[PDB]
Design a protein around this nucleic acid. Sequence first.
RNA 1: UUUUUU
Length: 374
Amino acid sequence: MSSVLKAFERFTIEQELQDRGEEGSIPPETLKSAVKVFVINTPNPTTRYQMLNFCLRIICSQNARASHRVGALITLFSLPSAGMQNHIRLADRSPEAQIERCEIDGFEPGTYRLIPNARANLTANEIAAYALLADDLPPTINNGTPYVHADVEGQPCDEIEQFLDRCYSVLIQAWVMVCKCMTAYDQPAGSADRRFAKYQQQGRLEARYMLQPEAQRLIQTAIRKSLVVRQYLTFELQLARRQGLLSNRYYAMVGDIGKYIENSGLTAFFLTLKYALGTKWSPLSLAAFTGELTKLRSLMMLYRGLGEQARYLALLEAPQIMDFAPGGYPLIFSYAMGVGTVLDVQMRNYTYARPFLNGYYFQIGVETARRQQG
RNA sequence: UUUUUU
């Protein structure tokens, strides 16, 4: 019946785009932790550099609460901006965020103890607790410092041009660790080494300021655990995507790495589109499954409806990422994995093994791909 | 649920 087939297409599309949600919707308020973010009002290379090392040591300190790491990360990401407070208002948007700004004037010489501003709220108990935190590095860390080179932390910065080199190298490493914090973690990574080689070749990253892999893994762990930090990083990525050809040294880097962070955790969706709708010889095979084709059409509609934030569904860890899971289109997923194993050597390394992977349509895709080739 | 490469 033509009416039932037309009705079913409409029903399928409606059921999938009914999950778009509200762009400005605010969830019901739930308890949240208080986060203390440290702000430098003026551009002091000495103070800024010190705060960079302080926050790197807080992020890696074993005796540090989740709130302490979250504040240290927000401060570390905000070190480049000329106005720290106005850049921290971006972090405040997070619905799970309750950030308190603390203005720091300096550090006591020869110590990690903070010197709070008159307006800034810092007790003598907190200052001592933070100083003890900044000196609690893990055993896996060598030379008593996060960096690979011992002399780097001790180096004195008296110019803005120096702090910028140090800061941008550290933040390049932090962003590369973001690249696979929610998807790949607690395992050896080849891509991370490749990104570092690329950015050292570009001259963006300096090997004199590399961190130890243990510190990089600790930074990745701290970023993955907090939703405030990951939402703030999506805000920074969207700021980097709005730029034109003319841009700053920092947001050019952030856009370059956002190219690699984009569409993480949606590999099955984009590989299915690529190898099932990309090849002109797939319509003849999958023409029969109209229901799954309508599903993929409604998913391409849902992706556009989500907006720019759709590229960072995995970083944001939003529920709409369950719509793009291949268990809702298993036959076409199977066919596309078959086609892609022939056409892409790199795809073989990817784990396409699923409980629901149809072996018949996998082999249909393999034989179709090879047939066209030979 | 994710898991490749760019």
